[PDB]
Amino acid sequence: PEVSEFAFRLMMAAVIFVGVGIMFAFAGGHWFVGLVVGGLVAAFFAATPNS
Amino acid sequence: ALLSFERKYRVPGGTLVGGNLFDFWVGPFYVGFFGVATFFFAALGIILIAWSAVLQGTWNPQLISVYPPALEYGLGGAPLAKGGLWQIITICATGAFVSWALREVEICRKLGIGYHIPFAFAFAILAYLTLVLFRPVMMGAWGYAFPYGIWTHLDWVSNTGYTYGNFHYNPAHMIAISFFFTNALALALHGALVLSAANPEKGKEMRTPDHEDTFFRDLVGYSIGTLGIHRLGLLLSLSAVFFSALCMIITGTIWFDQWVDWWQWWVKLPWWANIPGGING
Amino acid sequence: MSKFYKIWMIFDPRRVFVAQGVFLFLLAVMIHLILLSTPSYNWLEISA
Amino acid sequence: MSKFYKIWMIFDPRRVFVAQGVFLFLLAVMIHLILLSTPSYNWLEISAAKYNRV
Amino acid sequence: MSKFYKIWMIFDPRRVFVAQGVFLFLLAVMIHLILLSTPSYNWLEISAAKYNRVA
Amino acid sequence: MSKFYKIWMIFDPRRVFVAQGVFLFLLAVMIHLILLSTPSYNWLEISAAKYNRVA
Amino acid sequence: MSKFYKIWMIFDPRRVFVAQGVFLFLLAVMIHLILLSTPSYNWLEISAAKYNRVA
Amino acid sequence: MSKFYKIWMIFDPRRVFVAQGVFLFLLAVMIHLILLSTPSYNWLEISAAKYNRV
Amino acid sequence: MVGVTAFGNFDLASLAIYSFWIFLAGLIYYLQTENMREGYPLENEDGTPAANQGPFPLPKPKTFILPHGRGTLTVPGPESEDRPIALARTAVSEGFPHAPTGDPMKDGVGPASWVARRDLPELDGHGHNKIKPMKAAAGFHVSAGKNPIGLPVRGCDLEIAGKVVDIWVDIPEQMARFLEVELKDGSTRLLPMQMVKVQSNRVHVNALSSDLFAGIPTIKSPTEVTLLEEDKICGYVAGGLMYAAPKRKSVVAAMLAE
Amino acid sequence: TNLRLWVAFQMMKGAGWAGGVFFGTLLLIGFFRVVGRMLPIQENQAPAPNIT
Amino acid sequence: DLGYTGLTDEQAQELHSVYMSGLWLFSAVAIVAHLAVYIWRPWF
Amino acid sequence: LGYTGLTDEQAQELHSVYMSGLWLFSAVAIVAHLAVYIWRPWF
Amino acid sequence: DLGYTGLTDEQAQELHSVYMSGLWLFSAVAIVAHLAVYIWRPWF
Amino acid sequence: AEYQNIFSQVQVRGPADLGMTEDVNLANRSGVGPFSTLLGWFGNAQLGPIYLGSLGVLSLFSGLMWFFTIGIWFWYQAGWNPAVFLRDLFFFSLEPPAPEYGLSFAAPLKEGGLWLIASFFMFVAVWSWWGRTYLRAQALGMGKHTAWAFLSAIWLWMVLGFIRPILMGSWSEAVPYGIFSHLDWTNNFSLVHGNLFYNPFHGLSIAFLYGSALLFAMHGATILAVSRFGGERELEQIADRGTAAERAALFWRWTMGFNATMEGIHRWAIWMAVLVTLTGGIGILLSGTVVDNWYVWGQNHGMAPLN
Numbered sequence A: 001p002e003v004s005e006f007a008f009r010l011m012m013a014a015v016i017f018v019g020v021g022i023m024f025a026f027a028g029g030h031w032f033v034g035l036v037v038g039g040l041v042a043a044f045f046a047a048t049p050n051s
Numbered sequence B: 001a002l003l004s005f006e007r008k009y010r011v012p013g014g015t016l017v018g019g020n021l022f023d024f025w026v027g028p029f030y031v032g033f034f035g036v037a038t039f040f041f042a043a044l045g046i047i048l049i050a051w052s053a054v055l056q057g058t059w060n061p062q063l064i065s066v067y068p069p070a071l072e073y074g075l076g077g078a079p080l081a082k083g084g085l086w087q088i089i090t091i092c093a094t095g096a097f098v099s100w101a102l103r104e105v106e107i108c109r110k111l112g113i114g115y116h117i118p119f120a121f122a123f124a125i126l127a128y129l130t131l132v133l134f135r136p137v138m139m140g141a142w143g144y145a146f147p148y149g150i151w152t153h154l155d156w157v158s159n160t161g162y163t164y165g166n167f168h169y170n171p172a173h174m175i176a177i178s179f180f181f182t183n184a185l186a187l188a189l190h191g192a193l194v195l196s197a198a199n200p201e202k203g204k205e206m207r208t209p210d211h212e213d214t215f216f217r218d219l220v221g222y223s224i225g226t227l228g229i230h231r232l233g234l235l236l237s238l239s240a241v242f243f244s245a246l247c248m249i250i251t252g253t254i255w256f257d258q259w260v261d262w263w264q265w266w267v268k269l270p271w272w273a274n275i276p277g278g279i280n281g
Numbered sequence C: 001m002s003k004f005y006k007i008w009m010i011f012d013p014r015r016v017f018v019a020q021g022v023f024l025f026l027l028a029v030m031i032h033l034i035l036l037s038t039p040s041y042n043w044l045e046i047s048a
Numbered sequence D, H: 001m002s003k004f005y006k007i008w009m010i011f012d013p014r015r016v017f018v019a020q021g022v023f024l025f026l027l028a029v030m031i032h033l034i035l036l037s038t039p040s041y042n043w044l045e046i047s048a049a050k051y052n053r054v
Numbered sequence E, F, G: 001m002s003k004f005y006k007i008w009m010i011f012d013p014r015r016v017f018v019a020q021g022v023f024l025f026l027l028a029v030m031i032h033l034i035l036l037s038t039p040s041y042n043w044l045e046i047s048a049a050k051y052n053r054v055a
Numbered sequence I: 001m002v003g004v005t006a007f008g009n010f011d012l013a014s015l016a017i018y019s020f021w022i023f024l025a026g027l028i029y030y031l032q033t034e035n036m037r038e039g040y041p042l043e044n045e046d047g048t049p050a051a052n053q054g055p056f057p058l059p060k061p062k063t064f065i066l067p068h069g070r071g072t073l074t075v076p077g078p079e080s081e082d083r084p085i086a087l088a089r090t091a092v093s094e095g096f097p098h099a100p101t102g103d104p105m106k107d108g109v110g111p112a113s114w115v116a117r118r119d120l121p122e123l124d125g126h127g128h129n130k131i132k133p134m135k136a137a138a139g140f141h142v143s144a145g146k147n148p149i150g151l152p153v154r155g156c157d158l159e160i161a162g163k164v165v166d167i168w169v170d171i172p173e174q175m176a177r178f179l180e181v182e183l184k185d186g187s188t189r190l191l192p193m194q195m196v197k198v199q200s201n202r203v204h205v206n207a208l209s210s211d212l213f214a215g216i217p218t219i220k221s222p223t224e225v226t227l228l229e230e231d232k233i234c235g236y237v238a239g240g241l242m243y244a245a246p247k248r249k250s251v252v253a254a255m256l257a258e
Numbered sequence J: 001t002n003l004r005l006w007v008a009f010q011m012m013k014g015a016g017w018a019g020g021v022f023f024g025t026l027l028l029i030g031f032f033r034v035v036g037r038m039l040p041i042q043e044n045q046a047p048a049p050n051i052t
Numbered sequence K, M: 001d002l003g004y005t006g007l008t009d010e011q012a013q014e015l016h017s018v019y020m021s022g023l024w025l026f027s028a029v030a031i032v033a034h035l036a037v038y039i040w041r042p043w044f
Numbered sequence L: 001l002g003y004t005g006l007t008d009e010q011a012q013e014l015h016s017v018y019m020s021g022l023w024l025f026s027a028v029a030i031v032a033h034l035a036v037y038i039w040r041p042w043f
Numbered sequence N: 001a002e003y004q005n006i007f008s009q010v011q012v013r014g015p016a017d018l019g020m021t022e023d024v025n026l027a028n029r030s031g032v033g034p035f036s037t038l039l040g041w042f043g044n045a046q047l048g049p050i051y052l053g054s055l056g057v058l059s060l061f062s063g064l065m066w067f068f069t070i071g072i073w074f075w076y077q078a079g080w081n082p083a084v085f086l087r088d089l090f091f092f093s094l095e096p097p098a099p100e101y102g103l104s105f106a107a108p109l110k111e112g113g114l115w116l117i118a119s120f121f122m123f124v125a126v127w128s129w130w131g132r133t134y135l136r137a138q139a140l141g142m143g144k145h146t147a148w149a150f151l152s153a154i155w156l157w158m159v160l161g162f163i164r165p166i167l168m169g170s171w172s173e174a175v176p177y178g179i180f181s182h183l184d185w186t187n188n189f190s191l192v193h194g195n196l197f198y199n200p201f202h203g204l205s206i207a208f209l210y211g212s213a214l215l216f217a218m219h220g221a222t223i224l225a226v227s228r229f230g231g232e233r234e235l236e237q238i239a240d241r242g243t244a245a246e247r248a249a250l251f252w253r254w255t256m257g258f259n260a261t262m263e264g265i266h267r268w269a270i271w272m273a274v275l276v277t278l279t280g281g282i283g284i285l286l287s288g289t290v291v292d293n294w295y296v297w298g299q300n301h302g303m304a305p306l307n
């Protein structure tokens, strides 16, 4: 109940990764397209924690 | 039996179980509650291996093999002569390992150092429990575990590896092998660098950490630092084990065909699955 | 056996009682599993 | 034999009883598992064949 | 063989007794397991055949 | 050869005796295990054939 | 020839003796294992064939 | 030829002797092992054929 | 040489594998002796050499020529504690814990122990002080993460005992080593960066309680810290983990409390 | 302050910790048993890796 | 009077009597359980 | 000679109590061995 | 009088005398145990 | 749930460290590159400078030409198709000549001749780099431990690609230049030689490869555990033993009975990793040249149940 900014940033990135991955796996014809787009956005989101 | 500086650190406390009941040293070893469990499980495990050699009918240490129960017994008990001993040894081995890790925890608290060492050891145990417990339970047979033999647990590796064709194509395996190779590369570099800085050319002064960073910056243009390399050593080893545990827990549970067949998904991507030329088509 | 009480001046009582509780439970678990291992004495199977 | 009490002048009773407790229980578990392994003296197996539990 | 007591001037009594205890137990366990391996001198197998416990 | 006692002016008796103790035990074990390996000189198997233990 | 004693001015007597003790034992173990491996000179087996220990 | 003693002003006698001793032994092991490998010059088998040991 | 056996099954592969066992046995001996250059010869629990020294003999001494003219260090050598150990034997038989005679954190025994290192600051390759405050450091600044300066310092008892004022930086490695925590009395103590957890709004020091913050050993010079002062500070704080357990409010601390 | 309860409480304390650890271990074993049953292991399963 | 735990002789006697009483109670119940099983399924 | 700090009398009391436990343990073992030998001899 | 262990000669003699008595007791039990085995199953 | 020192919780960025200047020709040394915050969380953030001398140039030129030659063959195998190039990147391979040609250099350029050219570039590249490690240590006056630790790696590398093919009298025994090919070469190596697991020297290398992971996990965790006492500065602990060195000594002394020093642990570290390839080179060298089947060799040496 005392998550830091980095802890919350990672948790949202995992949620974003799963969410966006499913989004572009449906949109694209392959699951890899979701993995790439979901991974890149989550990595970009988790690498920029506001502080 | 004490080092020239050991006395001032030998104080009570830090025990997880037993208090001062087992808080004593046998020679250099610290006993603790979990060391008593360690010695019992270690001694019992060793004897049953020796007794298993009697039942097997061989005394050559390399031919000694404690095979797990056959696939027909599933995940139940087995006769001691045909699998039951392996289950007792595995329970003894599991008890000995976890007691050893928890004994290290007591030594950590007594010395006031971090719990990185028992946490590092716990990764090995979960790697061990993956092969003997987690993977066989998912596959529903103790026979999928490996025998407790020097050269028969290699037969298990070779047989399990070739069940899925060339096991090199396991993607989690490739990650772990790169980590194992990287860790050994880092250890050789790290060990050699400090010795070079501490045992330099004859007559020259003992070098400083700056020479260590200067050497590797003149070599590969980047020095990770004394703190970084030990962080790197810990993470490289744990990642290698974590992916090795992962590689087996997905094999025979999520993937069942040859691992080379898995890699065709990349070739069969929609935008180049049908382009002529190259290796695949 | 009239001086076995003196063992409590050797080993701390509360520490032993906790350890003995662990030992008795694990020993009870040990024997029950061995009985289940044998095809007979396996009460969970012979009933059904 | 009457001087064997001097073993405690050398060995602390706390460590010995811990060492002895482990040793005896290790020894006791060792022998029971040896008997169970052999087809004879496996008293669980002996009664099953004697009373047709199969 | 009269001055063998001087071994205790060289060897610590505590360490030897622990070493001797471990040595004797492991030596005794080794010899018993050697006998059990051979079909003869495996007294567990001997009594089974002598009193016909195989059936 | 009367100056062989001088070996103790060079060799620490404590380390030699432990090394000698381990060496003698391992050497004694090794010769016994070599003898137990051969079909002959395995006194366990010799008695079995002599007294018809294997039947 | 006579001046060979000066080797101890160069070589540490303790280092040589330990190295020599290990060398002699390992060399002796090696040659004995060579003789045991050959069908001849395996004195255990040739005596067994001499008195017909196994037939 | 007569000034070969000078070479000890360049080489440390201890390291040369240790290196020489190891090399001589390892070379001696190698040749004695090579001779055993060939059916000829295997003096153990040579005597066996001569005296009809087998 | 496929199948060429000198005798029995012994062949070139068999030659190599045994020759390695000899090499590995020799190598393990060599490695172990090198490890015996520190802490040896062994001593009894009183301070006299023990009757047991181990199967591996001590190595021939080697000399380390220290940098910056600090002298030489020959090991194995006569090593002394050079400090009174305030510990009391709890049993005449060896292999038993020594209980502290007084306050262990102040007496520097147990987890709070420290070594009589050279009472000089540690130098870089250029002869300057390796560890300096960021204020006296030339150009150093916080580059990433939460800046701990100005944050309240909360002890293991969940009570604020001061605030961070300055950061000490290892100039070659360019990483922070100490936090200079100013207490309520106006003096500033040093806290190792490894023993603090800079949270979003506070510096949580799980090692020490609020009342124990004043007890941290102080530095003789505000601009530099010697090796001896580092050990006393690092020892004291890390000794707080076991010696401030009654004062810690954590759930796991209560479960592991006596 | 009852001595009989105090001794029984200690032994129950140890038995509870051993019980929780043993029950926790069974939970992991049961979890992997459930997951293996859910996954299509029985439909296609590997042969014996070691000689029975 | 070794005093390794600090308990007086009287406390050791009282604790041992408590411990033995529980031991015989535990032994008695185990004997009943063994009788029950041997009646249900003898192992000899 | 002193290693554990026990006096000669304390050792004698300690040994006597220990020996009492040993013979009690041995007696149950002898009873157990007779019971097993009667039920199924191993000689 | 090397005295590596710190024992005096009198202490060594008393320790050895008790140690040999324990050894002869251990040897005596072994000799009986070997007689029992040799009678029941000679290995020569 | 406290600070485990795995990642730095704060970064400080001072001026770039230009390094020591014992005997290093500063003309051949480059300038300081960027500062990486991402790298700063784990280790140092500064990249560069890097020394580039004569052996540095030879290492790069041969290293680039080795990398370039594999790439051109990778493009030719792709038909110069960028889409095919990325699709079959791991499945590309610069195979060595066919077994018929033996050690002869008469192989056609597209049938093994190109591999000889690429292999030559790698050979020069690696050996020139080994001297570079040697000379960089000599320039700063340090020990040659890296040079000989590297030579252990070269021994296995020489054996796989150069020495063993010569003894087998065929370039076909060498290693193809590809991601999946040199994996397939590895698998085909064991199968041809009869379960390379039963190679005693391969087993030893796995022992030291496992041990290197074991020792670095042990050593890395130990120093991070005693990093709260400034134990990461291992060179000062060797010079002046602090409390971290003593606790690190005592933890392993109370755990497994024996310990090491702050300097002697790194002797274990270097020898644990060196034997990985040292025993590896002998293990591969014997295969085929001395043992054509390890499992049959294992049977005759009491490692397998049969025989």
Ligand code: BCL
Pocket (backbone or CB within 6 Å): B157, B181, B184, N122, N125, N126, N153, N154, N156, N157, N160, N185, N186, N187, N188, N189, N190, N191, N195, N196, N197, N201, N202, N205, N206, N209, N276, N277, N279, N280, N281, N283, N284
């Ligand atoms: C089916 C496959 C076979 C098998 C076949 C082989 C073969 C074949 C070999 C090994 C080898 C190895 N095997 Mg095996 N192996 C199998 C099963 C296993 C298992 C297991 C759990 O099953 C394990 C743990 C191992 C483990 C190992 C390693 C211990 C060892 C390699 C050391 C190393 O670092 O090599 C990798 C490191 C190198 C080759 C050194 C490289 C050094 C050079 C100088 C680097 C140059 C860099 C170059 C220029 C690129 C630069 C790039 C730029 C920097 C960007 N094997 C099975 C039985 N294994 C090797 C060995 O030595 O065996 C004895 C070997 O040749």
Ligand SMILES: COC(C)(C)C/C=C/C(C)=C/C=C/C(C)=C/C=C/C(C)=C/C=C/C=C(C)/C=C/C=C(\C)CC/C=C(\C)CCC=C(C)C
Pocket (backbone or CB within 6 Å): E003, E004, E005, E006, E007, E009, E010, F024, F027, F030, F031, F034, G025, G028, G029, G032, G033, M001, M002, M003
């Ligand atoms: C494979 O090859 C095979 C095995 C087939 C053949 C074997 C070949 C080989 C290599 C054989 C090698 C044999 C060797 C080297 C044998 C050597 C044996 C020796 C030298 C044995 C020595 C025995 C000595 C003993 C047991 C001495 C014991 C001493 C005491 C009991 C007294 C100790 C007490 C003392 C000294 C008191 C100290 C005194 C004072 C004043 C303080």
Ligand SMILES: COC(C)(C)C/C=C/C(C)=C/C=C/C(C)=C/C=C/C(C)=C/C=C/C=C(C)/C=C/C=C(\C)CC/C=C(\C)CCC=C(C)C
Pocket (backbone or CB within 6 Å): G003, G004, G005, G006, G007, G008, G009, G010, H030, H031, H034
């Ligand atoms: C492929 O291999 C095969 C087998 C096929 C063929 C082999 C080929 C090869 C490569 C063969 C190589 C042969 C070589 C190089 C042989 C070299 C032989 C030499 C040079 C031998 C020298 C021997 C010298 C000895 C043993 C000297 C001993 C000296 C002493 C014992 C006295 C030393 C003592 C001293 C100096 C006292 C110190 C004095 C003072 C004043 C301090």
Ligand SMILES: COC(C)(C)C/C=C/C(C)=C/C=C/C(C)=C/C=C/C(C)=C/C=C/C=C(C)/C=C/C=C(\C)CC/C=C(\C)CCC=C(C)C
Pocket (backbone or CB within 6 Å): C024, C027, C030, C031, C034, D025, D028, D029, D030, D032, D033, D036, J004, J005, J007, J008, J011, K018, K019, K020, K021, K022, K023, K025, K026
């Ligand atoms: C290999 O394994 C197999 C299974 C094949 C065979 C196993 C063999 C072996 C080695 C077995 C080992 C057996 C051993 C060593 C058994 C030891 C048993 C002992 C000595 C148990 C002691 C029990 C003592 C107890 C439970 C004492 C309890 C005392 C109290 C609770 C305090 C008194 C308070 C009372 C009675 C009031 C309690 C309060 C309430 C509210 C009921």
Ligand SMILES: COC(C)(C)C/C=C/C(C)=C/C=C/C(C)=C/C=C/C(C)=C/C=C/C=C(C)/C=C/C=C(\C)CC/C=C(\C)CCC=C(C)C
Pocket (backbone or CB within 6 Å): C003, C004, C006, C007, C009, C010, D024, D027, D030, D031, D034, E025, E028, E029, E030, E032, E033, K001, K002, L013, L014, L015, L017, L018, L020, L021, L022, L025
């Ligand atoms: C290969 O494996 C097989 C099994 C086939 C063959 C194995 C054979 C072997 C190696 C067998 C080994 C046998 C041995 C050596 C057995 C050892 C037996 C002994 C010596 C047992 C000792 C028992 C002693 C007991 C249980 C003592 C109990 C004492 C007490 C309960 C009282 C303790 C309390 C005291 C002293 C309080 C005193 C305090 C004050 C203050 C006066």
Ligand SMILES: COC(C)(C)C/C=C/C(C)=C/C=C/C(C)=C/C=C/C(C)=C/C=C/C=C(C)/C=C/C=C(\C)CC/C=C(\C)CCC=C(C)C
Pocket (backbone or CB within 6 Å): D003, D004, D006, D007, D009, D010, E020, E024, E027, E030, E031, E034, F025, F028, F029, F032, F033, L001, M011, M014, M015, M016, M018, M019, M020, M021, M022, M023, M026
């Ligand atoms: C694989 O090879 C096989 C197994 C087939 C053949 C085996 C071969 C080999 C290598 C066999 C080896 C046999 C050996 C070395 C046997 C040695 C046995 C010995 C020497 C045993 C020693 C027994 C001594 C005993 C039990 C002494 C007991 C003493 C006491 C209980 C009293 C202790 C109390 C004391 C000393 C009081 C202290 C005094 C004062 C004043 C404080």
Ligand SMILES: COC(C)(C)C/C=C/C(C)=C/C=C/C(C)=C/C=C/C(C)=C/C=C\C=C(C)\C=C\C=C(/C)CC/C=C(\C)CCC=C(C)C
Pocket (backbone or CB within 6 Å): N067, N068, N070, N071, N072, N074, N116, N117, N119, N120, N122, N123, N157, N158, N159, N160, N161, N162, N175, N176, N177, N178, N179, N182
């Ligand atoms: C678009 O991309 C461009 C074209 C710009 C650049 C890209 C290049 C690419 C994609 C490069 C890819 C490289 C890869 C995949 C390299 C993989 C290498 C691997 C996995 C190597 C593994 C093992 C190799 C070994 C062991 C090689 C050993 C070689 C030697 C020991 C040298 C042997 C020396 C010989 C044969 C000399 C013969 C010549 C003469 C004159 C005697």
Ligand SMILES: COC(C)(C)C/C=C/C(C)=C/C=C\C(C)=C\C=C\C(C)=C\C=C\C=C(C)\C=C\C=C(/C)CC/C=C(\C)CCC=C(C)C
Pocket (backbone or CB within 6 Å): E017, E018, E020, E021, L043, M026, M029, M032, M033, M034, M035, M036, M037, M039, M040, M041
């Ligand atoms: C002549 O002998 C009789 C009367 C038995 C003749 C009988 C013959 C026949 C036909 C017998 C029938 C069957 C057989 C073969 C019986 C065999 C029985 C055997 C082999 C019995 C062996 C008993 C051994 C015992 C009770 C050994 C006890 C030894 C200990 C508990 C070791 C204690 C030593 C310690 C703790 C040393 C510790 C010292 C230090 C310093 C740590």
Ligand SMILES: [Fe+2]
Pocket (backbone or CB within 6 Å): B190, B194, B230, N219, N223, N234, N266
């Ligand atoms: Fe390090």
